[PDB]
Design a protein around this ligand. Structure first.
Ligand SMILES: Nc1ncnc2c1ncn2[C@@H]1O[C@H](COP(=O)(O)OP(=O)(O)OP(=O)(O)O)[C@@H](O)[C@H]1O
Ligand SMILES: Nc1ncnc2c1ncn2[C@@H]1O[C@H](COP(=O)(O)OP(=O)(O)O)[C@@H](O)[C@H]1O
Ligand SMILES: [Mg+2]
Ligand SMILES: [Mg+2]
Lengths: 48, 1067, 202
């Protein structure tokens, strides 16, 4: 599920994709994640 | 008494001619009688308030103040009430049309129907009471009409804003409704039966449709019309009289125009097929065939005939020589027909045909210079091919465009006339590269510096393949939803996108847009072998005519760079230098010139020399964008000189025509140092060059009259004000040729007065009223300049420039007849001025984030009162015409004459005894201002003197003017305090002659330290021959000029004062 | 302190920058081109010398530090060129120590240019094109002088190169010259001694 980071809808798409990937197990790819470090903090914390 | 009676007689004439005036009530489809005839009422109220204002000043207004004031405020409240009334009626007409014609609105919005019925009952009661008493005074006579009308306007705006969700539903009905704003689509749906209201809106929908050819019964659409008068007649006219919905007959019109254009393309290519078989051709049949068909079909049929002739020659050198001979013979025929005067539509048809024919001549020579023996050789495959299969049953698919391993259909969208580009080898490379990007289902992306032909080559490739194109100029407020909305609009319409300046789009937003671009490319790959794709998580139909093009500049204003995932989706292509020689030769061949090739060969190295030899400046452009405007002005002045000769064939001095156009276009950009360098360039390049200018005596004398009216000093060319009037003439010439203008130069050169005096002179000459909108762009935010897209509810508000342009476009007060001058009184920087690089472009339109494209009517001129153009890039500098106002154009004696003229007339406490005081003060300050005197030498010396702030002329000059105005008021109150003895003239002389010295000391030295103003005081003591306070130690700053004409010491003014014990350190 | 070493190096730098004359009505393009180049160089030398004197006085003297002087102090501590001095083409933002040497080279070239202009005579000079601000202005002025003297056509003028205009300061890239015949070699660069340019129509 290739979702490019950089919009609000991209953030919600990435969040729902990562919850679906937690439950189902298929891969999730986020493109150009360095454009929003303030969401990268909670992404790293939620992944840990 | 007789003059006062004449003024009262004119007042009674106003009374009688306003008693005769009335409201023109005309029945509207047997519903109510609504009032028409609005510009007549507008100019009536305007001329009446102008008459009351003109009779106010002089000379017997004082006895008859009361009736004229009553007529003034009577006209004022009539104007206010009817100004809100026209908007109320205009909104109510289309809202009633929507609430009647559209169905299932009561099921959808019941509160909207109940309100609208309440306001419709109130409004129809208002129609009943005007239809009883159609007099204007009687309609005004009902109390509380203003509050009722303001509440009606508020209710109409409410209902409009609470209805706006439904419009997007209608945007899913018709595709092109995506390209329409809220108010324009509201008018479009509302007036579907009125029809004639909608013909102002068809320019935004289609590429070449300006108005629909309508029957007198207004129920059969006979055809379509372009903006240049060219009309396409429908073979099978659509029957509105069958009562379909608006989108149904709109789609029928869209399909019918494509079928019809294919049918006349087939007939025209049959005509060229039976024409081209003759080695010698008759020019009369050729010109009747040219006048028979449209320009697009004629150029297309010429391309098909040339392609088929070259292909049958290449089936097999001698048939290719025959094709080249026929091409040269038709080129000579076109040159002979274009060297004579022609109507302008067929003149542009001849220009397009001669450009295409010489392009085919160059290509045919390019094949024939080598040995080509088969049609499958790549050298023939490296150019454009056209194929018409006459046995094909579907005329929409009858024409194929075949380029290097790429095949395309024809969208058959009507275009009109437009601009035909030049097929340079760079343009051939661009066409081949960009159609190879299109064949692999990839978007295109040209890049390069501005002034190379990036977006225009893309647009002419779009018009070459017949696809509908759109040009957007995206700024940083382009959102995810805005880009998705215009993408789904392009999806349902099926049109090419020409996104310009994509680089300034907010890198995260660029990455977010890349996913939708990938979805579109995946849909096109699915199409390339019931095909949909997901935009905004919605699956929508994708037409096979999709294409997206990305015109960007690398680091022009430090704009953002493309991410690497989005860079793979768009193929890159670089044009840095276009071939200026070939485009100059073909434009001079197409305008009609004998020595066109020598003119190109002498003007392209001339631009190469003039790019380098002049000094480096912020506002210098010598690129192709300036060359095209120079060639356009050269063609226009060549037509003007030919018509001037024929007013009283033969050859004409084309060299002098080109040199005159070059001078008139490129003089006002240059500073005073670079004029003799350009003159020596013109002398060395052109031996028999010469020059001519001026010949604007009526304009110069009207400028003289309006200059002496508004206290300016007109000059005759070599006089004191000659250079300023010459620069105003240059401004007039650039407004004659160009579109938007820079007025560059240092602050204090009279550029404000220059454009004001030009506007008033043009109003006095041509009779067209000139209205100016002055906007400071840095006084408000960019989001307030253009408008805000609300992120929750996607509504588009209006910025200041958007509101001004929308008020011009609406033309409710007849604003299109008047001249509209929008001046930006700020400083140009690429944060906001890069939103206007489509307005100042030849695309001539304004783009919005809502998809609402606002075209610009040619009555409006956009100018800039600006200081310097360093901060702007070449996307704005090269895309405007620059008028340079140097600091020595406004000389200081001009400002002195302005001050003395404002002193003699226009009394200060706005004849009067203080006006006589001002006049005598003017006569006794007159020997000091003029020539060197006192003020000029002291002001020159003060520039060598250092100050705390930056010191120019105008700040301390205005300071000195306020000094002398207070001196005049001081004399006035002294005469008030001494009624027995008035102000004696020798006392006034010996008072003002010292007040001016004290004033100029506190003006040119009031903003620095004590030592430095003492230095200017001893300079004043050493230089001028005025009486002085005789003390070599005490400077003149420590003295005060008294009412008796002498000096009192300031140190004698201060006392030895003690203060009370209670108030020691009170603030 | 740090400002003491700043003042020591600040007196070290301008010892190769002394003065330049200003020398504007002549028919030949070379004369006006050299006049405006000498004017630009003298203006830049005056600005650089005045700024160096100002920062010297605000270091050790009775002069206070303004915003421009503070920016100058920080920019010359970091060694990068301030944006006020870099008017001409500096390659990719070099340091100030090589830039003042290049500035002194250009000023010495313009001093010899003004000495030759004090006294055609201007054709007899030899020029290194790196020391000029705009080299293509010199090339177009040479072409204009040829077209003015010989009354020729500017459109078809070509260039003939020998190793009547003398050009110095030319450096090759991995090639050598021998009787105007190019040869390949493993050397990085060689310096062309004198290059004669003559404009021929054919
Ligand atoms: N030709 C002229 N004749 C008489 N007075 C003039 C003329 N040109 C300018 N002035 C006077 O010069 C003063 C300032 O000129 P103006 O307001 O037009 O400045 P400007 O160049 O438009 O300024 P800015 O670009 O800074 O906005 C005014 O008092 C104006 O009357
Ligand atoms: N081959 C050609 N024929 C005619 N006009 C051309 C040609 N090439 C370029 N032009 C003109 O050069 C100008 C270049 O515009 P451009 O700088 O690409 O616009 P933008 O500012 O959007 O980049 C256009 O106005 C175009 O009319
Ligand atoms: Mg463009
Ligand atoms: Mg002004």
């Amino acid at each position: 599920t290739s979702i490019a980071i950089g919009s609000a809808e991209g953030f919600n798409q990435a969040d729902k994709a990562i919850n679906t990937a937690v439950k189902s197990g298929r891969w999730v790819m986020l493109k150009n994640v360095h454009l929003a470090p303030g969401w990268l903090m909670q992404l790293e914390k939620k992944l840990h | 008494a007789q003059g006062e009676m004449a003024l009262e007689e004119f007042l009674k004439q106003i009374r009688e001619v306003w008693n005769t005036y009335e409201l023109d009530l005309v029945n509207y489809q047997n519903k109510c009688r609504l009032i028409r005839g609005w510009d007549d009422l507008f100019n009536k109220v305007k001329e009446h308030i102008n008459s009351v204002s003109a009779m106010k000043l002089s000379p017997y207004y004082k006895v008859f103040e009361e009736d004229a004031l009553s007529w003034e405020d009577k006209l004022n409240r009539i104007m206010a009430l009817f100004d809100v009334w026209i908007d109320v009626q205009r909104r109510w007409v289309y809202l009633e049309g929507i609430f009647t014609g559209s169905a299932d609105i009561k099921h959808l919005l019941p509160v909207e129907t109940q309100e609208f019925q309440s306001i419709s009952t109130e409004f129809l009661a208002l129609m009943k009471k005007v239809s009883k008493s159609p007099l204007v005074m009687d309609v005004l006579n009902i109390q509380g009409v203003q509050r009722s009308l303001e509440r009606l306007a508020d209710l109409l705006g409410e209902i409009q804003k609470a209805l706006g969700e439904y419009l997007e539903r209608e945007r899913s009905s018709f595709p092109r409704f995506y390209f329409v704003g809220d108010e324009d689509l509201l008018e479009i749906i509302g007036n579907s039966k009125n029809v004639a209201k909608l013909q102002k809106h068809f320019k935004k929908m289609f590429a070449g449709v300006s108005s629909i050819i309508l029957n007198e019964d207004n129920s059969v659409v006979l055809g379509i019309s372009s903006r240049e008068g060219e009309e396409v007649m429908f073979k099978t006219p659509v029957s509105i009289t069958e009562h379909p919905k608006i989108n149904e007959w709109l789609t029928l019109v869209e399909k019918e125009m494509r079928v019809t254009l294919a049918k006349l393309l087939a007939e025209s290519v049959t005509e060229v097929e039976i024409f081209g078989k003759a080695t010698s051709i008759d020019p009369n049949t050729y010109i009747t065939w040219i006048d028979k068909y449209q320009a697009q079909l004629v150029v297309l049929s010429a391309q098909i005939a040339w392609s088929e002739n070259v292909e049958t020659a290449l089936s097999s050198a001698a048939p290719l020589h025959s094709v080249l001979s026929n091409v040269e013979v038709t080129l000579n025929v076109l040159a002979d027909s274009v060297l004579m005067e022609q109507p302008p539509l067929r003149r542009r048809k001849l220009e397009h045909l001669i450009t295409e024919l010489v392009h085919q001549r160059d290509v045919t020579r390019s094949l024939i210079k080598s040995k080509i023996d088969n049609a499958k050789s790549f050298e023939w495959l490296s150019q454009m091919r056209f194929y018409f299969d006459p046995k094909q049953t579907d005329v929409l698919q009858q024409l194929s465009i075949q380029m290097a391993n790429a095949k395309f259909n024809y969208g058959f969208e009507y275009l009109g006339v437009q601009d035909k580009l030049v097929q340079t080898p760079l343009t051939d490379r661009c066409y081949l590269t960009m159609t190879q990007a299109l064949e692999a289902r990839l978007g295109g992306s040209p890049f390069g510096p501005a002034g190379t032909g990036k977006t225009e080559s893309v647009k002419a490739l779009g018009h070459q393949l017949g696809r509908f194109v759109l040009v957007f100029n995206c700024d940083e407020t382009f959102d995810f939803q805005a880009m998705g909305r215009i993408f789904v609009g392009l999806c349902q319409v099926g049109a090419w996108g020409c996104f310009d300046e994509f680089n300034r789009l907010e890198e995260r937003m660029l990455s977010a847009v890349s996913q939708q671009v990938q979805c579109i490319q995946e849909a096109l790959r699915e199409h390339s072998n019931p095909i949909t794709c997901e935009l905004l998580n919605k699956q929508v139909k994708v037409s096979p005519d999709m294409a997206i093009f990305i015109t960007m500049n690398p680091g022009y204003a430090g704009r953002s760079n493309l991410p690497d995932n989005l860079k793979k989706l768009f193929r890159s292509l670089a044009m840095t230098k276009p071939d200026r020689q070939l485009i100059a030769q073909v434009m001079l061949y197409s305008q009609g010139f004998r020595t066109a090739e020598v003119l190109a060969n002498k003007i392209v190295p001339f631009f190469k020399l003039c790019d380098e030899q002049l000094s480096s400046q912020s506002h210098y452009d010598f690129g192709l964008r300036a060359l095209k405007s120079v060639l356009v002005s050269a063609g226009n002045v060549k037509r003007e000189r030919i018509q001037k000769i024929k007013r009283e064939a033969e050859n004409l001095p084309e060299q002098e025509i080109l040199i005159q156009s070059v001078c008139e276009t490129m003089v006002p950009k240059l500073v005073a140092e670079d004029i003799p360098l350009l003159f020596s360039l013109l002398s060395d390049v052109f031996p028999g060059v010469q020059y001519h200018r001026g010949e604007m005596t009526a304009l110069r004398e009207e400028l003289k009259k309006v200059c002496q009216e508004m206290y300016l000093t007109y000059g005759d060319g070599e006089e004191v004000g000659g250079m300023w009037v010459e620069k105003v003439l240059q401004l007039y010439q650039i407004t004659q040729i160009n579109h938007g203008l820079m007025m560059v130069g240092p602050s204090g050169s009279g550029k404000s007065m220059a454009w004001r005096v030009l506007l008033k002179a043009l109003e006095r000459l041509e009779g067209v009223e000139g209205v100016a909108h002055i906007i400071d762009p840095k006084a408000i935010s960019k989001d307030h300049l253009y408008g805000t897209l609300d992120p929750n509810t996607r509504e588009w508000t209006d910025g200041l420039f958007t509101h001004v342009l929308r008020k011009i476009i609406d033309s409710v007060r007849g604003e299109l007849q008047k001249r509209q001058w929008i001046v930006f009184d700020g400083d140009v920087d690429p944060e906001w001025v890069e939103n206007l690089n489509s307005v100042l472009d030849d695309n001539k339109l304004l783009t919005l984030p809502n998809g609402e494209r606002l075209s610009l009517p040619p009555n409006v001129r956009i100018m800039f009162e600006v200081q310097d153009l360093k901060y702007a890039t070449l996307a704005t500098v090269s895309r405007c015409g620059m008028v340079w106002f140097s600091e020595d154009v406004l000389s200081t004696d001009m400002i002195f004459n302005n001050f003395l003229a404002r002193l003699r007339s226009i009394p200060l406490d706005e004849a009067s005894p203080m006006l006589q005081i001002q006049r005598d003060a003017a006569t006794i300050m007159q020997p000091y201002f003029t020539s060197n005197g006192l003020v000029t030498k002291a002001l020159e010396h003060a520039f060598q003197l250092e100050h705390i702030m930056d010191l120019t002329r105008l700040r301390c000059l205005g300071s000195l003017f306020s000094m002398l105005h207070q001196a005049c008021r001081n004399v006035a109150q002294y005469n008030a305090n001494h009624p027995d003895f008035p102000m004696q003239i020798e006392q006034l002389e010996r008072y003002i002659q010292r007040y001016l010295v004290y004033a100029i000391l506190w003006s040119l030295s009031g903003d620095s330290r004590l030592k430095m103003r003492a230095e200017l005081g001893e300079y004043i003591r050493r230089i001028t021959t005025v009486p002085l306070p005789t003390a070599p130690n005490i400077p003149i700053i420590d003295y005060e000029v008294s009412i008796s004409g002498e000096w009192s010491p300031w140190q004698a003014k201060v006392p030895q004062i003690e203060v009370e014990t209670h108030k020691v350190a009170a603030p | 302190t740090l400002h003491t070493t700043a003042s020591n190096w600040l007196h070290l730098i301008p010892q190769t920058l002394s003065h330049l004359k200003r020398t504007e009505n002549i028919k030949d393009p070379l004369f006006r081109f050299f006049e405006r180049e000498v004017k630009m160089g003298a203006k830049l030398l005056q600005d650089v010398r005045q700024d160096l004197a100002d920062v010297v006085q605000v270091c050790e003297g009775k002069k206070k530090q303004t915003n421009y002087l503070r920016t100058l102090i920080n920019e010359l501590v970091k060694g990068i060129l301030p944006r006020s001095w870099s008017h001409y083409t500096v390659p990719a933002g070099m340091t100030v120590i090589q830039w003042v040497s290049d500035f002194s080279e250009r000023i010495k070239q313009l001093q010899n240019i003004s000495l030759a202009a004090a006294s055609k005579e201007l054709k007899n000079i030899h020029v290194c094109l790196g020391g000029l601000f705009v080299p293509e202005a010199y090339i177009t002025a040479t072409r204009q002088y040829v077209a003015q003297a010989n009354s020729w056509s500017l459109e078809e003028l070509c260039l003939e190169v020998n190793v009547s205009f003398g050009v110095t300061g030319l450096k090759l890239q991995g090639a050598t010259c021998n009787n105007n015949k190019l040869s390949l070699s493993n050397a990085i660069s060689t310096a062309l001694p004198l290059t004669q340019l003559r404009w021929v129509k054919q």
